[PDB]
């Protein structure tokens, strides 16, 4: 059901795979982050350990804050492919 | 029942396959999302785990919100193919 | 699901791997830093041992302060790749 | 009763085997856990033995809490296989 | 009584075999589950044994709840085969 | 019941083995720790024997405190394998 | 009266043998347990002999409590064999 490489069943299967992979990624990261939170403690506000550990958790927070826009762009990517497939069908179906 | 590659039984079979694949995709994603919801808990509004986990679920929500337009475009795709087949039949049947 | 080398499932897997690796790195460094803090003591403000040891912990603090910008740039890196993939798709999909 | 490797009697036998194996696993683990609970005592809240033994039972509780999602995913696995078999039948039966 | 591989007596025998196998599976699982229920006791709501045993029975309940949709899909599978056989007969009987 | 190496009965047996091994480990360590607690006495707070013995029990406490995160990660490991098996099934079942 | 190894008279003889063996086992164990009960006395609640003897009778009670589920599973075993024989007959009698 297509012309050259655009196949609607293939697109549906690809969406299935992408959705399930993202679900697994979210599940695994969320499970692991709880273990991280449990492991690290809060020594004191001003002792040596605080100076040793604070920037690491700051980087954790920053990178985990950068993920959401990555996911948004990854979601936006598919609409471009679908529109390109539609346009390619239109171009030489007539 | 056609001219070159447009076959009405083939179109019906293709619609059957697309519908059943989309049904399976919806079923599997809906089943898996319940397990995800059960697995992740709500630690606290302001502790370390919240900062570690919140953007991930934000990305989950965003991507799952992007699916509906993908499905709408995927549905729109078929009408173009059917109309192109009709026009191709008309062009050289007479 | 792509054109030449841009594969959305591959991108999702890469994000999974990067996230889990960063989580392991943060966990290991945070665990080890507590052992470092426990091991080193505070001899006195002005004796020989203080002169012998202070610049080392100063370098510890400085380098651990340099990590956060490294993590920020590492996070920024991925958006460039995703945008480049989108542009590459757009260039020759039409 | 199938096309290449999808056999409904074989699927039924596989479900039988999986169910009976899970039943045996639950029975054996539940029986053994009672013996574990009987064997370990509660020395005191703050003596040496408590410090020596508490994290072990904490790990017991954690791992036994991780089983339920493992079972849920194991159950979800079969629906994917059945749907794949149905789709494979549909693809080349017509 | 058929054309290539579609044989009505063979279909009837296959339905017989599937029905009897499902009957045996239900009988065996139902018999075994009573023994499981008898074996496991209820220690207390909050002692060590409860923490040790509760998630296992939760997984039991979940997986046994996942069976019904598996059976429903297994039943749906046969109609597809019968319809495919009918269509295959129609295609080249005329 | 699988495609290449993913076998649901094998997964169930593996979970059985892992659970029983962890149960035996917890039981043996808990039994032995009571004997350790009984054997070592408390000489005095400041005599020679205290200086000779205290860091050893400190290391005991520390290592036994490190076990819980080891168990948590060991539990997390299985979900990755199950998700990978599901994804591998999805990839080439269709 | 069978196909390869399933013989109804043989099955009946096997059931006869199993029943008579279980009857003999129950009779012998019940007779011997009375002699055990007669032989052991009750010295006192707190003297040396009580500490010396109580766990042994506790183990007696526990093991004799484990027999019933063993008998239940042994009884369940035969239904599986009979159903397997029926299915094997059905498979190649037609």
Closest CA to B48 of G66, A34, F52, C81: A34
Contacts of D86 in chain B (CB under 8 A): 20, 24
3-class secondary structure per residue, chain D: CCCCCCCHHHHHHHHHHHHHHHHHHHHHHHHHHHHHHHHCCCCCCCCHHHHHHHHHHHHHHHHHHHHHHHHHHHHHHHHHHHHHHHHHHHHHHC
Tell whether A75 lies on the interface with B, counting CB pairs under 8 A: yes
Closest CA to E9 of E19, E18, E1, E20: E1
Distance from C-alpha of D90 to C-alpha of A58, rounded to nearest angstrom: 53
Helix (H, G, I), strand (E, B) or coil at C29: helix
* Rg value, chain E, Cα: 22
With contact defined as beta carbons under 8 Å apart, do B59 and A67 qualify? yes
Tracing tokens 């005191």 back to the chain, one arrives at D44
Tell me the angle at which helices E8-39 and D8-39 cross, rounded to the nearest 10 degrees.
Answer: 10
Tell whether A59 lies on the interface with B, counting CB pairs under 8 A: no
Based on the number of CB atoms within 10 Å of its own CB, is C7 exposed (0-12), middle (13-18) or buried (19 or more)? middle
Vertex F44: Cα angle to F38 and F50 (nearest 5)? 80
Q: Do F68 and D58 touch (CB under 8 A)?
A: yes
Contacts of E24 in chain D (CB under 8 A): 16
Closest CA to A41 of A64, A30, A57: A57
With contact defined as beta carbons under 8 Å apart, do C86 and A80 qualify? yes
Q: Do D72 and B24 touch (CB under 8 A)?
A: no
Write b or e for each residue in B20-49: b if 16 or more Cβ atoms lie within 10 A of its Cβ, otherwise e: bbbebbeebbebbeebbeebbeebeeeebb
Q: Alpha carbon of E37 to those of A12, E58, G76: distances in Å?
A: 43, 13, 15
Helix (H, G, I), strand (E, B) or coil at E2: coil
With contact defined as beta carbons under 8 Å apart, do A13 and B21 qualify? yes
Distance from C-alpha of F42 to C-alpha of F33, rounded to nearest angstrom: 16
Of E63, E77, E87, Cβ closest to residue D22: E63
Of D52, D60, D74, Cβ closest to residue F26: D60
Write b or e for each residue in G77-94: b if 16 or more Cβ atoms lie within 10 A of its Cβ, otherwise e: eeebeebebeeeeeeeee
Q: What is the DSSP string of F1-44?
A: --SSS--HHHHHHHHHHHHHHHHHHHHHHHHHHHHHHHH-----
Sign of the dihedral defined by the CA atoms of residues C33, C35, C40, C42, in that order:
positive
3-class secondary structure per residue, chain G: CCCCCCCHHHHHHHHHHHHHHHHHHHHHHHHHHHHHHHHCCCCCCCCHHHHHHHHHHHHHHHHHHHHHHHHHHHHHHHHHHHHHHHHHHHHHHC
Closest CA to A35 of F74, E7, D93: F74
Distance from C-alpha of F37 to C-alpha of D53, rounded to nearest angstrom: 10
Sign of the dihedral defined by the CA atoms of residues E65, E70, E75, E79, in that order:
positive
Closest CA to A16 of B22, C11, B74: B22
Q: Alpha carbon of C31 to those of C24, C37, C49, F66, G40: distances in Å?
A: 11, 10, 26, 10, 59
Method in brief: cryo-EM
Cβ count near E20 (within 10 Å)? 16
Tokens standing for residue D66: 């991780």
Residues 6+ apart with CB under 8 A from E40: D27, D30, D31, E53, E57
Q: Alpha carbon of E84 to those of B5, D84, G8: distances in Å?
A: 22, 17, 41
Q: Alpha carbon of E90 to those of B12, B15, E7, E11, E85: distances in Å?
A: 16, 20, 14, 18, 9
Q: Do E57 and D30 touch (CB under 8 A)?
A: yes
Q: Phi first, then psi: what are they for F46, rounded to 5°? A: 140, 0
Q: Alpha carbon of E18 to those of A45, E54, E70, E77: distances in Å?
A: 69, 35, 14, 12
Tokens standing for residue D34: 């009672």
Coarse DSSP helix, strand, coil percentages of chain B, rounded to the nearest 5 percent: 85, 0, 15
What is the rounded (10 degree) CA torsion for G23, G29, G32, G34?
-90
**DSSP tag of A2:** -
Based on the number of CB atoms within 10 Å of its own CB, is A62 exposed (0-12), middle (13-18) or buried (19 or more)? middle
Report residue E9 CA to chain centroid gap: 24
Tell me, yes or no, whether chains A and E touch by having 3 or more C-beta pairs under 8 A. no
Q: What is the DSSP string of E28-94?
A: HHHHHHHHHHHH-----SSSHHHHHHHHHHHHHHHHHHHHHHHHHHHHHHHHHHHHHHHHHHHHHH-
Tokens standing for residue A39: 């492991």
Tracing tokens 């982050």 back to the chain, one arrives at A33
Longest alpha-carbon distance in chain A:
74
Tokens standing for residue G60: 């007696």
* Rg value, chain G, Cα: 22
Distance from C-alpha of E74 to C-alpha of C58, rounded to nearest angstrom: 68
Q: List the chains bordering chain G where 3 or more Cβ pairs fall under 8 Å.
A: E
Of D80, D91, D94, Cβ closest to residue B28: D80
With contact defined as beta carbons under 8 Å apart, do D25 and F16 qualify? yes
Cβ count near C80 (within 10 Å)? 9
- Which residue of chain B has the CA closest to A90? B80
Q: Do B17 and D90 touch (CB under 8 A)?
A: yes
Distance from C-alpha of B14 to C-alpha of E15, rounded to nearest angstrom: 28
Distance from C-alpha of A59 to C-alpha of A36, rounded to nearest angstrom: 14
Distance from C-alpha of D75 to C-alpha of F11, rounded to nearest angstrom: 11
Vertex D69: Cα angle to D63 and D73 (nearest 5)? 135
Distance from C-alpha of E78 to C-alpha of E63, rounded to nearest angstrom: 24
With contact defined as beta carbons under 8 Å apart, do A71 and B63 qualify? yes
Q: Which A-chain residues 20-39 have CB contacts (< 8 A) with chain C?
A: 21-22, 24-25, 28-29, 32-33, 35-36, 39
Q: Alpha carbon of E1 to those of E9, E82, E85, E90: distances in Å?
A: 8, 15, 12, 14
Tracing tokens 């056989």 back to the chain, one arrives at E85
Distance from C-alpha of G84 to C-alpha of A62, rounded to nearest angstrom: 61
């Amino acid at each position: 059901f297509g012309t050259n490489g655009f196949d609607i069943p293939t697109i549906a299967i690809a969406l299935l795979i992408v959705g399930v992979i993202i679900g697994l990624s979210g599940l695994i990261l969320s499970i692991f982050a709880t273990a991280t939170a449990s492991a690290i403690s809060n020594p004191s506000p001003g002792t040596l350990a605080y100076n040793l550990t604070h920037p690491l958790i700051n980087g954790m927070v920053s990178f985990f804050s950068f993920f959401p826009t990555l996911y948004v762009l990854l979601g936006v990517t598919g609409i471009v492919l679908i529109a390109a497939g539609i346009i390619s069908i239109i171009m030489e179906k007539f």
